[PDB]
């Protein structure tokens, strides 16, 4: 390929991105962007696919270094560990009642 | 997935398993995806 060759004959580098999806756990993934943290307000949360609604407050329960969220005698979620700051948040239901 | 749980403990006893209770925290998960039917230790 000449240094001053014409465009119809110039060299051109090329890369092909070929995709593989076998029968196995997936390995190459797209990045997931995170919103910001809000406390003390009835909000709509999603911690690593764990989704729900309620009021997030701070707590004093102490997980074990490998645990992700708590549960209750009725097997309902009530606490969660934030993926980044590594704190323990309590979840309380959004107020409701009769009139 | 291939999952490995483990635990360490100190003992002073010979030639037999101690009678005790202790749980095993998870240690690693590796997403290989290979059929396994046999294994062997190395020492």
């Amino acid at each position: 390929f000449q240094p001053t060759n014409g465009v119809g004959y110039q060299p051109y580098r090329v890369v092909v991105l070929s995709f593989e999806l076998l029968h196995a756990p997936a390995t190459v993934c797209g990045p997931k962007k995170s919103t910001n943290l809000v406390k003390n307000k009835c909000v709509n949360f999603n911690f690593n696919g764990l989704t729900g609604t309620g009021v997030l407050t701070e707590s004093n329960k102490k997980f074990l270094p490998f645990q992700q969220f708590g549960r209750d005698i009725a097997d309902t979620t009530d606490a969660v560990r934030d993926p980044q700051t590594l704190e323990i948040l309590d979840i309380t239901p959004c107020s409701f009642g009769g009139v | 997935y291939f999952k490995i749980y483990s635990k360490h403990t100190p003992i002073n006893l010979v030639r037999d398993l101690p009678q005790g209770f202790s749980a095993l925290e998870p240690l690693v998960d590796l997403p290989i995806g290979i059929n396994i039917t046999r294994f062997q230790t190395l020492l």
Binding site: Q68, G70 | Y5, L17, G20, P26
Partner: peptide, 28 residues
């Protein structure tokens, strides 16, 4: 060259089945 030996695992090999926190409770 020896014959195989056996012994008795009294109560061993219990692992946290998953990554959930519970307190003062009896799970099944």
């Amino acid at each position: 060259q020896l014959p195989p030996a056996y012994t008795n695992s009294f109560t061993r090999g219990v692992y946290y089945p998953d990554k959930v926190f519970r307190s003062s409770v009896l799970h099944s």
